[PDB]
Every structure is written in structure tokens, then in C-alpha cells.
Amino acid sequence: SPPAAPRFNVSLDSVPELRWLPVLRHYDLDLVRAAMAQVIGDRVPKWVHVLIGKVVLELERFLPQPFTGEIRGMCDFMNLSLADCLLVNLAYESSVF
Amino acid sequence: CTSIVAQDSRGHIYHGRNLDYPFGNVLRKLTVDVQFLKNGQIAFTGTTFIGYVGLWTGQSPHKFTVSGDERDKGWWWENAIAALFRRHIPVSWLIRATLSESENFEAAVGKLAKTPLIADVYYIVGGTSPREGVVITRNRDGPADIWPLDPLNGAWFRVETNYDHWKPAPKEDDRRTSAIKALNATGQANLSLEALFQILSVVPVYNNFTIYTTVMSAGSPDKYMTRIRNP
Numbered sequence: 001s002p003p004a005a006p007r008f009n010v011s012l013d014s015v016p017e018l019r020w021l022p023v024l025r026h027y028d029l030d031l032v033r034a035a036m037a038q039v040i041g042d043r044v045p046k047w048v049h050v051l052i053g054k055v056v057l058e059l060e061r062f063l064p065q066p067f068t069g070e071i072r073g074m075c076d077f078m079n080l081s082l083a084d085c086l087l088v089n090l091a092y093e094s095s096v097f
Numbered sequence: 098c099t100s101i102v103a104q105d106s107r108g109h110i111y112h113g114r115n116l117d118y119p120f121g122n123v124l125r126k127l128t129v130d131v132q133f134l135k136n137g138q139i140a141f142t143g144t145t146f147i148g149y150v151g152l153w154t155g156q157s158p159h160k161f162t163v164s165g166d167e168r169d170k171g172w173w174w175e176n177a178i179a180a181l182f183r184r185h186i187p188v189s190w191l192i193r194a195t196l197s198e199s200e201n202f203e204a205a206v207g208k209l210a211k212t213p214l215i216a217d218v219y220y221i222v223g224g225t226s227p228r229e230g231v232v233i234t235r236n237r238d239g240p241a242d243i244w245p246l247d248p249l250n251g252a253w254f255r256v257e258t259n260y261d262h263w264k265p266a267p268k269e270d271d272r273r274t275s276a277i278k279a280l281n282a283t284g285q286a287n288l289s290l291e292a293l294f295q296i297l298s299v300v301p302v303y304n305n306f307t308i309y310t311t312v313m314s315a316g317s318p319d320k321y322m323t324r325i326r327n328p
């Protein structure tokens with residue numbers, strides 16, 4: 001059969017900001033960054049980019065944890081901009097993807 | 098996308114799905130199966146892309162399976178208002194919230210069908226007991242339709258691509274017919290996860306945009322399997 005997807009563990013007992021890091025350490029984070037740059041650049045209109053950045057201070061609070069903290073944890077670990085990590089995680093809702 | 102929930106002659110529920118999306122050459126590398134642990138024990142399993150915390154495919158052991166397909170309905174300002182002012186939650190986050198909290202199949206169907214969402218979606222849910230298979234066509238506020246299995250009347254499977262099941266499928270993108278033809282040829286007696294993988298390997302059910310195929314059965318949680326396509 002075709003190759004089975006890698007299988008990893010995520011402990012929900014850990015703080016949200018650290019939950020995914022044990023998994024990220026198995027990856028060349030540049031490849032995650034490269035996949036974001038191709039999917040984002042080829043889809044997002046600028047007014048959404050400004051808008052989400054305009055609203056990051058709100059989206060962080062009214063959207064339910066631990067989803068916001070988990071995203072912020074992986075984003076800092078990868079040295080990415082939270083506005084983009086939130087945009088990828090809301091790709092379906094933005095409708096532009 | 099394509100999601101299938103079906104029941105064999107023995108009363109067991111099987112659930113499989115293909116996740117179709119462009120940018121495969123980059124996202125295939127990022128596909129992972131994640132076992133989410135509560136106090137050292139597997140609370141639920143999910144499939145995502147590393148960097149994406151929501152689950153479009155998941156399993157609660159011995160409770161239910163969930164997968165979500167795209168439903169293109171409404172305008173952008175409906176998602177914007179639903180998210181900003183009406184405080185609806187993302188589509189893939191409700192799937193994960195359901196896998197973590199819901200105590201059984203019937204409870205998950207209710208959580209998935211009624212919790213307000215920022216966008217539309219098709220939720221396919223599979224359980225453990227007979228008849229426990231349903232397609233939830235979702236609106237932002239609630240369910241537009243609920244389509245359960247009916248094995249006794251011959252409807253032992255449900256197939257959901259990206260279109261309302263009560264209207265005809267676009268001839269331009271008709272993967273539903275191929276899935277049903279393959280299911281009709283497999284048969285309820287030969288139904289299995291392996292057989293469900295073969296069905297989801299049919300063209301064009303398995304197409305150029307398919308990134309991975311997941312097959313699962315909550316009643317047999319150890320057989321959860323995601324296979325990455327033509328890397």
C-alpha cells in the first residue's frame with residue numbers, strides 16, 4: 001500500500017503553547033514555511049491580510065482556546081507571524097482558499 | 098473531497114474519506130495522524146497538516162468517527178459576520194471539540210448538527226451500533242438536512258462529495274456515481290476497511306487533487322489508517 005502518514009502524539013495535559021512542539025521537532029520547519037508561502041500568496045487578497053492583522057487582538061480572545069494558544073505556540077516556534085498562522089487555520093472560513 | 102459511511106452485514110460501521118486539495122506536492126509531506134492524549138490515554142485520533150490544529154478527519158475510540166467535506170454556499174460577508182459578530186466557531190474546530198467532549202454517537206450528531214458555524218460544511222458521522230451513520234448537511238445556524246443510514250431498506254451506505262444529496266450532481270465533477278457504483282459492486286457482505294480503501298481508490302473519486310485517504314471504524318479503533326497519495 002502507499003506510504004502511511006507519520007503518526008505522532010499530542011498530550012492535551014501540556015500547556016497549549018507547547019502541545020505541538022514535540023511533533024514539530026520531527027520536521028524541517030522551513031518546509032512548513034514554504035508550504036504556507038505558496039498557498040497564502042496564491043490565494044489571499046491584501047485587504048484580508050491587513051484585516052486579519054487589524055483584528056488579531058480580537059481574534060485571539062473571542063475564538064476559543066486552546067485553538068488560539070496552540071496556533072500561537074507553533075507560530076512562535078517557527079518564527080512566523082501570528083496573523084498568517086491564524087489565516088492558515090481559518091483558511092476554510094476565509095473562503096478565498 | 099469524498100466521505101463514505103457504510104454498514105456491513107454484521108452491523109459494523111466503516112468510515113472513509115478522501116481529502117482533495119491543490120498544493121499536494123507541499124501538503125503531502127505535512128500530513129500526520131495525531132493521537133490526542135488525556136492523562137496518558139488516547140482520547141481521540143485525528144488527521145491534519147502539521148501547523149493546522151483543526152481536524153477534518155477524526156475518531157473517538159469506541160464512540161464515533163467524523164469527517165468533514167466542503168460545502169460552497171453563501172458569501173464572504175456571511176462568514177465574516179458569523180465569525181466577528183455572531184460568534185460562530187470554525188468548521189474543523191467543532192469536529193475536534195466533538196471528538197474530545199461528546200460521550201457517544203448520538204451526542205456527537207447533535208453537537209455537530211446544532212453548534213453554530215462560520216461556514217457551511219458536510220459532516221459525515223459513523224458510530225458503533227447498527228444504523229449509526231449519517232450525513233449532516235450544515236448551514237451556519239443549524240442543519241439543512243440529516244440523512245441517516247437505512248440498512249433494513251437497502252441504504253447501507255451514504256456517499257457525500259461536495260454537493261447536496263437531494264439535488265443532481267454536476268456532470269462536470271461527478272465522483273458520487275463512481276463511489277456508489279464501487280459500493281454497489283463491493284456489497285454489504287464484503288464491506289471492510291480494505292474494501293473501503295479500494296472504493297476510495299477509484300478514479301475520479303481518487304483524483305489529481307487527492308492528498309490522503311483515511312479509513313476508520315470506531316468499533317475497531319486500532320485500524321485507523323491514513324495513506325498519502327502519489328507523493
Ligand SMILES: CCS(=O)(=O)c1ccccc1C(=O)N1CCN(c2nc3ccc(F)cc3s2)C[C@@H]1C
Binds near residue numbers: 091118127149167
Ligand atoms: C474542506 C477541507 S480542505 O482542506 O480541502 C479546504 C478546501 C477549501 C478551502 C479550505 C480548505 C481547508 O480546510 N484547509 C486548507 C489547507 N490547509 C493548510 N494547512 C497548512 C499547514 C502548514 C502549511 F505550511 C500550509 C498549510 S495549508 C488547512 C485546511 C485543511
Ligand SMILES: *[C@@H]1O[C@H](CO)[C@@H](O[C@@H]2O[C@H](CO)[C@@H](O)[C@H](O)[C@H]2NC(C)=O)[C@H](O)[C@H]1NC(C)=O
Binds near residue numbers: 008009132134137139
Ligand atoms: C503515544 O502514546 C501512547 C499512549 O500514551 C503510547 O502507548 C503506550 O506505550 C507504552 C510503551 O511505550 C505502553 O506501556 C502503554 O501501555 C501504551 N499505552 C497505550 C494506551 O497504548 C505510545 O507508545 C506513544 N507513542 C509514541 C511514539 O510515543
Ligand SMILES: CC(C)(C)CC(C)(C)c1ccc(OCCOCCO)cc1
Binds near residue numbers: 181
Ligand atoms: C472574519 C475575519 C475577516 C476577521 C477572518 C476570516 C478568516 C473569518 C475571514 C472571513 C471572510 C473573509 O473574506 C474573504 C474575502 O474574499 C473576497 C475577495 O476574493 C476573509 C477572512
Ligand SMILES: *[C@@H]1O[C@H](CO)[C@@H](O)[C@H](O)[C@H]1NC(C)=O
Binds near residue numbers: 029077078079
Ligand atoms: C527563531 O528566531 C530566534 C531568534 O530570536 C532563533 O534563536 C531561533 O533559532 C529561530 N528558530 C527558527 C526555527 O528559525
Ligand SMILES: *[C@@H]1O[C@H](CO)[C@@H](O)[C@H](O)[C@H]1NC(C)=O
Binds near residue numbers: 251274277278
Ligand atoms: C445501487 O444499488 C441499489 C439497489 O440495487 C439501487 O437502488 C441504486 O440505484 C444503485 N446505484 C447505482 C449507482 O448503481
Ligand SMILES: [Cl-]
Binds near residue numbers: 217
Ligand atoms: Cl467557503
Ligand SMILES: [Cl-]
Binds near residue numbers: 193194197
Ligand atoms: Cl480539544
Ligand SMILES: [Cl-]
Binds near residue numbers: 254
Ligand atoms: Cl448514497
